[PDB]
Amino acid sequence: GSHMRNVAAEQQLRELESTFDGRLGFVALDTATGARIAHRADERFPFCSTFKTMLSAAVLARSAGDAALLQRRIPYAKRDLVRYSPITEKHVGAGMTVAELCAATLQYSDNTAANLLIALLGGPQAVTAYARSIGDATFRLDRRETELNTAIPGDERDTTTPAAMAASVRRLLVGDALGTAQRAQLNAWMLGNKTGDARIRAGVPAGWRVADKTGTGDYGTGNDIGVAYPPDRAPIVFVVYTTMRSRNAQARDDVIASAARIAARAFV
């Protein structure tokens, strides 16, 4: 790629934002060169379910010094369920293993699974602490599911910036924040995501493998973060955050795919 292609990409991202009643936060980092395509990279956005990557990384980091942690079964009752728990709703009572909860929260965005893992780690503050430990000074998890998706304008609870999240995703999925086995497992879970077919995956070349985690919330908040693995190039980190001015707004898969498409064309 080149500086001029990246500049043009950034202009195209500004044009894309002008098509909807909201704002676009975007970073694509080419790990071949360290080059970045950015749009509103240092504005805070509500992360919604994209935090589940940070959450699962924290669990994996803990498992590195306690292999049997991943097999621990966590019980829970129906009364502990929250909205959007398609996997955990099927296993109330005896519950599920820690590994199963990670797969559920990453691949189906299961909310109760996330709450159980947040509890296991020591609460929302423990997830923020993990982020701090990997060099992320920006990420903050303040609430649990599903309140963390309120996406209220000016509310800094449960937010990060596209730049901070891209740096963290790079460290976790490509770099050395996790041990080899743990990085492989985090990638494996995210490669098998079921909720992201219309987002980053829809915008980048079909030949690229994508490990992603989506987020959707109030104010039409529509997010997707992850890494694309081209067959002939180094990995590219993608972070796409969008949110809208109206409470009646809905997330826009197409805008997220379009943003990724614009950047993919520049990193040649």
* C-beta atoms surrounding 190 within 10 Å: 24
In order of 82, 163, 235, the CA distances from 4 in angstroms are 47, 21, 21
Tell me whether residue 49 is one of the annotated catalytic residues. Answer: yes
Choose the catalytic residue: 18, 49, 56, 63.
49
At the top level of CATH, which class does the domain 1-268 belong to? Answer: alpha beta
The full set of domain ranges for the chain reads 1-268
User: Whole-angstrom Cα distance, residue 68 to residue 42?
Assistant: 39
Please name the method used to determine this structure.
Answer: X-ray
Question: Resolution for this model in angstroms, one decimal place?
Answer: 1.5
